[PDB]
Amino acid sequence: KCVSYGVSQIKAPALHSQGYTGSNVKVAVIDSGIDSSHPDLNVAGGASFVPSETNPFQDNNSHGTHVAGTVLAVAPSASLYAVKVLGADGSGQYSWIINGIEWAIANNMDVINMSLGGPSGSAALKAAVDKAVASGVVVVAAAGNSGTSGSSSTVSYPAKYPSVIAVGAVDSSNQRAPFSSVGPELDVMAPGVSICSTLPGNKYGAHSGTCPASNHVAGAAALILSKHPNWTNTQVRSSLENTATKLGDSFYYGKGLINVEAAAQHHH
Ligand code: NA
Ligand code: NA
């Protein structure tokens, strides 16, 4: 029975104790959908942009359900939105993802979690995440799982786009997971090793990757906006990046581990 640590590691529970659980914060899980039938997962709304997989509350991959459980473990009162842009196989067209981002914008999502990416992006995709940040949305994305490539950034899109918050993985010891992607694009780190979350069919499992880490930051964003609803995505992002626990060189750790308790008491 996998046991969660990552929530207490970013210091979420300190906010919970003070009554900030992400209430009235719209979090778009732009992923493989969310198994809403999971009794621990409460999904406020959704939309599927996968022509052949038309139910966004049906996660045939399992990845988005894992995302939801972590976002909701960090931010339990957060209105969670199943934006299905990824098929059963966990891949989708950019047009689909863009449609998901477009939707997230259209429906006033406070936070986009895109626990997804790849080696390249597109003008259209950059346009979409930019547009979403211009509209005041906190865009969070996994930095990637490409480890290191010498001096080369291994940070994946859309996380590689300046507008997107790029989230690397540390373990319980704040040690960079060997798989966590690296580059100047790297902003923050968050629990991303053996991360216990919800899986389809009332199941749970540890998963590792910059995706779990991202889900914490998306949750952290939600916690921060539930204390500070009038904070811009800009202020949320600076509060997360500027109060982060310094952990190592920016290329491997960005600013370090997200401390949501510190981020939530930040003075701009
Ligand atoms: Na449910
Ligand atoms: Na970025």
Residue numbers in the entry: 2 to 75, 85 to 278
What text does the study give?
Omniligase-1 is a broadly applicable enzyme for peptide bond formation between an activated acyl donor peptide and a non-protected acyl acceptor peptide. The enzyme is derived from an earlier subtilisin variant called peptiligase by several rounds of protein engineering aimed at increasing synthetic yields and substrate range. Mutation A225N in the S1′ pocket and F189W of the S2′ pocket increased the synthesis to hydrolysis (S/H) ratio and overall coupling efficiency, whereas the I107V mutation was added to S4 pocket to increase the reaction rate. The final omniligase variants appeared to have a very broad substrate range, coupling more than 250 peptides in a 400-member library of acyl acceptors, as indicated by a high-throughput FRET assay.
In comparison to the Pre-1 and Pre-2 variants, Pre-3 has the additional mutation A225N at the S1′ pocket that is also present in Oml-1. This remarkable A225N mutation almost doubles the S/H ratio (see above), which asks for a structural explanation. The sidechain of Asn225 in the α-helix close to the active site has a hydrogen bond to the hydroxyl group of Ser125 providing a more restrained position than in Pre-1 or Pre-2. Furthermore, Asn225 has H-bonds to the sidechain of Asn123 and the carbonyl oxygen of the non-oxidized Cys221, and thus makes good contacts, possibly rigidifying, with the local active site environment of omniligase-1. The S1′ pocket becomes shallower by ca. 2.5 Å but about 1.3 Å wider compared to variants Pre-1 and Pre-2, providing even less steric crowding (see above). The asparagine side chain is larger than that of a proline, but points in a different direction; it is located between the α-helices that the catalytic triad residues Cys221 and His64 are positioned upon and as a result these residues are pushed away from each other. The Cα-Cα distances increase by 0.4 Å for residue 225 and Val68 and by approximately 1 Å for Cys221 and His64. In summary, the A225N mutation could improve the S/H ratio by shortening the Cys221 helix in the same way as the P225A mutation, creating space for the cysteine. The A225N substitution also widens the S1′ binding pocket by pushing His64 and Cys221 apart, which is facilitated by formation of H-bonds to nearby residues and to two water molecules in the S1′ pocket.
